[PDB]
């Protein structure tokens with residue numbers, strides 16, 4: 130298992146927006162309490178889950194805890210960059226698993242909830 134994705138960067142700037150703020154306090158919290166959050170609340174432990182070549186196939190591991198700690202650190206550039214990390218998290222799951230499997234069903238239920246929540250987002 131590689132190190133978890135970065136949460137800070139010295140060469141990268143920091144800002145917050147009313148949208149990012151909505152992503153943390155509303156979107157991320159909504160998903161975080163979803164029934165199916167827990168496989169995604171922390172980086173995938175490919176070792177202990179026995180995922181073959183997980184980190185060869187998945188070149189951008191993403192997870193809601195990395196998202197979370199990024200949002201609290203205002204690591205992100207804008208709401209766009211944060212949504213994309215969410216999108217990466219679901220996509221990673223559809224790339225690595227057979228369509229129809231439990232985990233994919235779970236990512237799909239989180240994604241649909243995610244989608245409805247991102248419509249509540251204002252444009253800055």
Ligand SMILES: O=c1cc(N2CCNCC2)oc2c(-c3ccc4c(c3)OCCO4)csc12
Nearest residue numbers: 167168169173174178180221222225226232
């Ligand atoms: O793409 C993934 C592939 C699967 N599998 C596990 C079972 N064989 C089929 C492939 O597992 C995950 C997880 C995950 C699942 C269960 C967890 C978990 C993470 O962490 C806490 C303990 O239970 C996040 S993505 C992802």
